[PDB]
Design a binder for this molecule. Structure first.
Ligand SMILES: OCc1nc2ccccc2[nH]1
Ligand SMILES: [Cl-]
Length: 274
């Protein structure tokens, strides 16, 4: 019974993902996020071992549930006549990466390296659990400000990870690869690497590199801020036009720019004021 279990606070945000409210679990005063998604707005539907029909987002979240703090944890969910309600963990204080970059501008490379590394660990965890996120971007990354820890949110555009071709997509166009733009065809990991290149450019430059299809297709990267040669190299590698020319996750984390990463707590202390 959702009403007696949770105390609802103010709206945190709304959009393609639904409507998300601040909340508190009444039993232990635990901070939570209460996310409502209309059934009519749900694109595709998933399984669950017991065989009840839930949104794919519920399927994906349960598959990535663990002690690992790099991905948002699904605590509970309810079905209503016209909607599903998802109870998610809530770090406090928290800020999404989009608001963070909007406020601070382009990030120092040490900060970007720490953030980007944690994103890579989170995305590797998802793939490991058979989940493809499909909407990696600044707005879908939360910063636990006290701990310096990032969390992937909004799995509502995701899919079970497969090795065959995807011919469907409903994530964010400006983070989508040229093979999707040109052919409506992409493979999971190499498309994820593309979005990671877009994200990394966004962190160090303070905005995304491409706005229009023609720019995505052309793949020419211009740096508008001063960015180190090693960071530029990594970005341009992730944003290779041919999917098979893109780095693996392993090649990204072994890249010279990625070495000597700060611990999350170190990151909080130096860059988040902690
Ligand atoms: O899907 C938007 C969303 N905002 C959140 C805030 C805290 C925790 C989880 C959240 N999910
Ligand atoms: Cl979420």
């Amino acid at each position: 019974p959702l009403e007696s279990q949770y105390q609802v606070g103010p709206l945190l945000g709304s959009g393609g993902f639904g409507s998300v409210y601040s909340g508190i679990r009444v039993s232990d005063n635990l901070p939570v996020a209460i996310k409502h998604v209309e059934k009519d707005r749900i694109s595709d539907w998933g399984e669950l071992p017991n065989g009840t029909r839930v949104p794919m987002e519920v399927v994906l979240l349960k598959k990535v549930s663990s002690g690992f703090s790099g991905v948002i944890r699904l605590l509970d969910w309810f079905e209503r006549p016209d909607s599903f309600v998802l109870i998610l963990e809530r770090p406090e204080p928290v800020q999404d990466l989009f608001d963070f970059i909007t406020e601070r501008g382009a990030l120092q490379e040490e900060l970007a390296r720490s953030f980007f590394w944690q994103v890579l660990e989170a995305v590797r965890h998802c793939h490991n659990c058979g989940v493809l996120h499909r909407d990696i971007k600044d707005e879908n990354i939360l910063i636990d400000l006290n701990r310096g820890e990032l969390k992937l949110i909004d799995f509502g555009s995701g899919a079970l990870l497969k090795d065959t071709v995807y011919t469907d997509f409903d994530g964010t166009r400006v983070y989508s690869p040229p093979e999707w733009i040109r052919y409506h065809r992409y493979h999971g990991r190499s498309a994820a690497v593309w979005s990671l290149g877009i994200l990394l450019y966004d962190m160090v430059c303070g905005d995304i590199p491409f706005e229009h299809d023609e720019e995505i297709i052309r793949g020419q990267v211009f740096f508008r801020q001063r960015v180190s040669s090693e960071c530029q190299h990594l970005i341009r590698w992730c944003l290779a036009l041919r999917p098979s020319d893109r780095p693996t996750f392993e090649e990204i984390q072994n890249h010279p720019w990625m070495q000597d990463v700060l611990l999350p707590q170190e990151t909080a202390e130096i860059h988040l004021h902690s």
